[PDB]
Design a protein around this ligand. Structure first.
Ligand SMILES: [Zn+2]
Ligand SMILES: [Zn+2]
Ligand SMILES: [Zn+2]
Ligand SMILES: [Zn+2]
Ligand SMILES: [Zn+2]
Ligand SMILES: [Zn+2]
Lengths: 224, 224, 224
């Protein structure tokens, strides 16, 4: 009770609900103020775990909510509310499901190309994973971070396709060593896209390697 | 970065822009809440320099914004936003221009007679001048403070006009000693106003002194 | 002087020459005693850098010298003596050459398959590189450590050669990312050995991937 199972945390959940309600109709400044009030309440509970995710939600409001992407900040606020409400009940089996959903959206964001959504998503994933004693969901996070940053670096400049292919091989081997499977179909799709791009060009002796890589990771996914 | 060049300070700037937008359409309580949120953000950056000016902006909202003077609190919030944004870039040549504009506004307010605007402008000017290592723009601030307070004291009561004249000579000599120029033509205008008041009355042997004072100070400014 | 440029350090060097002389004629216990005396002397110099490498030399005597490998512990003690004598002269351009020789010996040991020599060599390399401010010579050391441990784990058990190929690709991508080229021809030779082993077997659809790997890595080595 008294800020350990209910009361203050229930107030935070109610405020987050009002924030989502405001977001779903368009008022972004009011939702930002409500999230600031929720952060002020959380600073008086001595949790050190909900304060960070509420700050992440506030920053998500700032970035995504102000611009045209209004449905990507409501998702962050919903994840914050669900993380808090899975802590007001002392439930650990729900944090794993929340982390699974968060990781699926990080994969979706990487596949799409959203930048502002991705940072808040990985921040939430790290916060959940550091409070769950999970290390198989954090090294995948680091590998995806490196992959995304290096992909952006190569796409901004005009580097050749060989370095991008090397990126794909490196991240595929890293995830294969990890053993994660849900992060591998996205990489398979991206490798197929790169193979289609290469097939447009006349350069050879790199397409056979790419096709062999796709077949190998697909076979391992079937095994996994 | 991380609250030293951007991030938190950029959030403060964005909230200040939202507050000004709210002010230019009339919602004062929402702007007050936004400024309170900005103050809460600034309290988490450890600056000791933007927090005070944001508090001054909050008080300016309280005083001017709640009353009919909606264009004089938007000015304070704009000055706060510009001071913060001239600090997120590490620019010192812009703080001098901001101080010049603030001092011009102080002189305009003293010429008009605004009381709530005057205190906020003086607080902003002192905050800027205590961070720029300037002592020429502070002694003139003290002289104008004393001049305004004594003017209000004489005008509230029924003191004789000779005391007002002595006040005028005293402040004119003080500003001549400090060497400031932009603060002295306002004194000339006030001296002409008092001379016009004197010429209305039949009392003599004090008006020629007033004319000589105006001519001498005008000649000194021409030299200045 | 007095244990900072000469005296005690020259005593240690002379004892190291005596240790080499004993090792080259066969007396291993006497060389071990001499190295222990040198360690005792170094403990009275407060270097914190020569003591560790002398301990490494002592352990190398213990392991390699006791068995028939008498030419592999003399090399370790020689490297220790050269490291000390390159510190009695205040020379930094010689530590780089010593690190080059040590890394070349690490590569030769990995290619040959020696285990006791390898650990002493990487210990010496780590001690030298932690006193030279080099980070391009440490990540390659970590990659080679992981490669050797995983290679031994695969060779001891009855794992399939597909995981061996995955190991090869992984370490090749890591070495390409760091950019080291002198550690890559040993990997080239091991990859050709694995390709010859695969050609013995009738299994296909993995030989083409391997061959493309050698071609690509050799092309990159030419570029490097
Ligand atoms: Zn806010
Ligand atoms: Zn495979
Ligand atoms: Zn307020
Ligand atoms: Zn004069
Ligand atoms: Zn011994
Ligand atoms: Zn390549």
């Amino acid at each position: 009770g008294p800020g350990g199972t209910m009361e203050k945390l229930k107030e935070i959940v109610k405020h987050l609900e009002v924030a989502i309600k405001y977001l779903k109709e368009g008022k972004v400044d009011l939702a930002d103020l409500v999230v600031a009030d929720a952060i002020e309440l959380a600073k008086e509970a001595g949790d050190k775990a909900s304060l960070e995710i509420l700050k992440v939600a506030h920053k998500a409001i700032d970035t995504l909510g102000r611009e045209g992407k209004l449905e990507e900040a409501a998702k962050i606020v919903k994840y914050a509310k669900e993380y808090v409400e899975a802590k007001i009940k002392g439930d650990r089996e729900k944090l794993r499901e929340l982390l699974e959903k968060v990781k699926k959206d990080v994969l979706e964001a990487i596949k799409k190309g959203d930048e502002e959504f991705y940072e808040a998503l990985v921040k939430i994933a790290r916060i959940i994973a550091e409070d769950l004693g999970d290390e198989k969901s954090l090294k995948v996070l680091e590998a995806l971070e490196e992959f995304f940053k290096e992909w952006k670096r190569l796409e901004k400049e005009g580097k050749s396709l060989d370095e991008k292919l090397h990126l794909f091989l490196r991240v595929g081997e890293r995830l294969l060593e990890i053993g994660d499977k849900e992060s591998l179909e996205m990489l398979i799709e991206l490798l197929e896209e790169l193979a289609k791009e290469i097939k447009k060009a006349g350069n050879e002796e790199l397409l056979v390697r790419a096709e062999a890589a796709i077949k190998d990771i697909r076979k391992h996914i079937k095994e996994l």
